[PDB]
Sequence to fold (21 residues):
Amino acid sequence: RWSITTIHNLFRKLTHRLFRR
Fold:
């Protein structure tokens, strides 16, 4: 369970390798 409200932006690119979906 990944609860990322706005931070999702700093992850969508940072962890894009994992959250590529």
Observations:
- The CA atoms of residues 2 and 8 lie 9 Å apart.
- The first helix runs from residue 8 to 12.
